[PDB]
């Protein structure tokens, strides 16, 4: 009845957004284990762009989410069908193409975000004040 | 065997800081209920200074985190005695006098702060690549 679901990313700067997104990947099943996987520093560097929190600073916001229950820091930059297995996930929840052989094998789970959340955001809300 | 502990605070921009001392709060017995009272806009504003983020704002973050098992929102500025008993609550745990009555009745559980962390701070680095 337990079922695995992996959701890996960034992480930089966690705010809201990434919480609610985590709560609803916890939340696909009555009973999950939600694993979450974090991107190295090399990796993400090289591919998304600059990252602002190193990994150990990434991994250990993580570490006092609700809905997490365990880790893996660091994380590969691509999922592959042998991670799945090595981890025994079940499912993958991530946003919406590289996941489409996780649609074809019936083991992409979505999940959607919330705007307007961002750290920097709040930096825009409280400069406006001069 | 389960013991009551309220915590109370601003929780503007809620970061590392406030968590692992809301898991110190957790942690200070076996069997713990957290209880995290969120100061109103109003009271905020008129003591502390300016605050960033609406009361609703800083009470949904709290939700999200692994150690809050209840909130009180808005919760009153001042701790008094009536309000121990009303939440049938058995030590409050703050920094370190207004909590001198607090510890003169065996009350008053201290928690640790961790600096470094602060949203700003992260600012204050990310600017620095320029």
Known sequence: ????????????MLHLGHMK???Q??????????IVGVTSDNETKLFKGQVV?????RTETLKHIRWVDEIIS?????????FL?????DYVAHDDDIYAWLKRAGKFKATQRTEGVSTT????????NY
Chains 1, 2 share one sequence.
């Open 1 to 12: 009845k337990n079922v695995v679901i992996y959701a890996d990313g960034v992480y930089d």
């Open 21 to 23: 997104q985590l709560e």
């Open 25 to 34: 990947a916890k939340k696909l099943f009555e009973n999950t284990t939600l």
């Open 53 to 57: 929190q190193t990994l150990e600073e």
């Open 74 to 82: 660091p994380c590969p930059w691509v999922v592959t069908p042998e």
């Open 85 to 89: 297995e090595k981890y025994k996930i």
């Open 121 to 128: 955001d709040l930096i825009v809300r409280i400069l406006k």
